[PDB]
């Protein structure tokens, strides 16, 4: 529950780590964003400069915190480090989860229903096994993560298909193939899943009479018909250092806003992407002022889908993915120490139009399946701009991306 005190909810898991109440929530937002930034940069490195990039970093943190609940030692420590939970001012590693839940409460349970922002988590564990009873309870109590019994052992590729359809249902059709083909096997014990959906209407619309098809040129040497939108109004805006523009497009309500970032034409995104931090982002935010301006942005849809393994390994999640060293003895009943994350996937969808925006994303951590290779199917394109959908009052980057192809 959201309306509760720190001691009230007995959320003491197995392990623990070292290292008014509203300020906890806020410290976790700083943590989350630091992860978000860093995760973004590593992920950027993996991709081309001209490739699209979209994701919910909030989603990832959530799914990995869910996982954290049955972690121990060199798995629990790394989890806190990598996801900057070891930054929040509190001495115990089980205190993260009370605040994450409260953050989640603020995010997904508001009276202000200008824009729709929902989330659904769920554990899908093998049917034959028994899961630690405290584990289970906290999972559902803190995150809302019910445990659904699927037949990993026998009917494997249909349970892969049932988790995907579950995500699909919770993301209004947008997120369809979270779990890639052939990743859930006969040994798959548990699959931890997050889901976030957003849909907002602009605070000020783009009339559809003013949209114009104009052609877009890629770095390879190709053309596509972009659909530019147009509008004129007062918008929080700033031309910052190096001739970079930061424009903010608030949604009906003012609580959630889309924040664009475009570099001076000559320059690339790289410089800005390489120096991108939470501090940097808030600087610009504080700088912005109300301005009469003409906005031209595309009518477009981007979808991004990837594994988090290599990237997260790079930032320090090494034990968790390791078959020999991974430490997760709070999940099942006996302490099965053959629990290790095979692979973890993410998939996001962005759609911006005249009427507003729709964003969806999902994260699925898979315990003991296979670890497949990055399945890449995307093309490079020119002149990219960063997008960020954020919740103002609670300092959280919900979605975050780099649009690079508006067709
Ligand atoms: C994801 O799965 C959800 C269930 O867990 C499911 O949501 C439920 O869907 C039904 C839709 O049939 C919702 O019920 C609606 O309730 C109102 C009651 O006021 C009805 O008016 C409405 O029926 C429509 O109304 C007409 C009758 O005047 C009829 O002619 C129309 O054709 C139509 O049937 C529904 O009965 C229910 O509230 C939903 N929520 C829950 C929690 O159950 C989702 O559809 C599914 N989403 C996706 C994307 O798959
Ligand atoms: C489920 O996990 C809990 C902790 O995550 C385990 O219980 C703890 O066990 C130690 C002693 O063995 C006690 O000091 C703690 O107070 C226990 N917690 C509770 C709530 O009992 C528990 O052993 C696990 N259960 C199973 C079946 O494995
Ligand atoms: C891991 O942590 C538990 C308690 O936190 C401790 O008992 C154990 O010795 C640690 N090390 C290993 C290798 O398990």
From Swiss-Prot:
Signal as UniProt keyword: yes
One CC-aspect GO term: extracellular space
Outcome following mutation: residue 143 to H: In AT3D; uncertain significance; type-I
Effect of residue 24 to C: In AT3D; Tours/Alger/Amiens/Toyama/Paris-1/Paris-2/Padua-2/Barcelona-2/Kumamoto/Omura/Sasebo; lacks heparin-binding ability
Effect of residue 18 to C: In AT3D; type-II; Rouen-4; lack of heparin-binding properties
Impact after mutating residue 370 to H: In AT3D; type-II; Glasgow/Sheffield/Chicago/Avranches/Kumamoto-2; increases affinity for heparin; deprived of inhibitory activity
Site features described as Reactive bond, chain residue numbers: 370-371
Residues reported in the UniProt entry to bind heparin: 26, 106, 122
Effect of residue 188 to I: In AT3D; type-I
Effect of residue 404 to D: In AT3D; type-I
Subcellular location: Secreted, Extracellular space
CDD domains: serpinC1_AT3
Residues bearing glycans: 73, 112, 132, 169
Implicated disorder: Antithrombin III deficiency: An important risk factor for hereditary thrombophilia, a hemostatic disorder characterized by a tendency to recurrent thrombosis. Antithrombin-III deficiency is classified into 4 types. Type I: characterized by a 50% decrease in antigenic and functional levels. Type II: has defects affecting the thrombin-binding domain. Type III: alteration of the heparin-binding domain. Plasma AT-III antigen levels are normal in type II and III. Type IV: consists of miscellaneous group of unclassifiable mutations.
Function text: Most important serine protease inhibitor in plasma that regulates the blood coagulation cascade. AT-III inhibits thrombin, matriptase-3/TMPRSS7, as well as factors IXa, Xa and XIa. Its inhibitory activity is greatly enhanced in the presence of heparin.
Protein name, as recorded: Antithrombin-III
Organism name: Homo sapiens (Human)
Gene assigned in the entry: SERPINC1
């Amino acid at each position: 529950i959201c309306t509760a005190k720190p001691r009230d909810i007995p959320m003491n898991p197995m392990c623990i780590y070292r290292s008014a109440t509203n300020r906890r929530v806020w410290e976790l937002s700083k943590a989350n964003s630091r992860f978000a930034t860093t995760f973004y940069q590593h992920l950027a490195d993996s991709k081309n400069d001209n490739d699209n990039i979209f994701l919910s970093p909030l989603s990832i943190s959530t799914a990995f915190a869910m996982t954290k609940l049955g972690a121990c030692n060199d798995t629990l420590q790394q989890l806190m480090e990598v996801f900057k939970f070891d930054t929040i001012s509190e001495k115990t590693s089980d205190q993260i989860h009370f605040f994450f839940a409260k953050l989640n409460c603020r995010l997904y349970r508001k009276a202000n229903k200008s824009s729709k922002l929902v989330s659904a988590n769920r554990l899908f564990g093998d049917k034959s096994l028994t899961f630690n009873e405290t584990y289970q309870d906290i999972s559902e109590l803190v995150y809302g993560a019910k445990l659904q019994p699927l037949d990993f052992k026998e009917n494997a590729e249909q349970s892969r298909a049932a988790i995907n359809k579950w995500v699909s249902n919770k993301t209004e059709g947008r997120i369809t193939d979270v779990i890639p083909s052939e990743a859930i096997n006969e040994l798959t014990v548990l699959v931890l899943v997050n889901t976030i959906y957003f849909k907002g209407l602009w605070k000020s619309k783009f009339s559809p009479e003013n949209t114009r098809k104009e052609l877009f040129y890629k770095a390879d040497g190709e053309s596509c018909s972009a659909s530019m939108m147009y509008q004129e109004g007062k918008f929080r805006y700033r031309r910052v250092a190096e001739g970079t523009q930061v424009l903010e497009l608030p949604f009906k309500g003012d609580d959630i806003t889309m924040v664009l970032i475009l570099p001076k034409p000559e320059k690339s995104l790289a410089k800005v992407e390489k120096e991108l931090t939470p501090e940097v982002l808030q600087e610009w935010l504080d700088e912005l002022e109300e301005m009469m301006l003409v906005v031209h942005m595309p009518r477009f849809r981007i979808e991004d889908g990837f594994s988090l393994k290599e990237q997260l390994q790079d930032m320090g999640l090494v034990d968790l993915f390791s078959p020999e060293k991974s430490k997760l003895p709070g999940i099942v009943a006996e302490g099965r120490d053959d629990l290790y994350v095979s692979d973890a996937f993410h998939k996001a969808f962005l759609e911006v139009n005249e009427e507003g925006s729709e964003a969806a994303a999902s994260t699925a951590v898979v315990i003991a399946g296979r670890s497949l290779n990055p399945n890449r199917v995307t093309f490079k394109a020119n002149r990219p701009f960063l997008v960020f959908i954020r919740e103002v009052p609670l300092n959280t980057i919900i979605f975050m991306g780099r649009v690079a192809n508006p067709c």
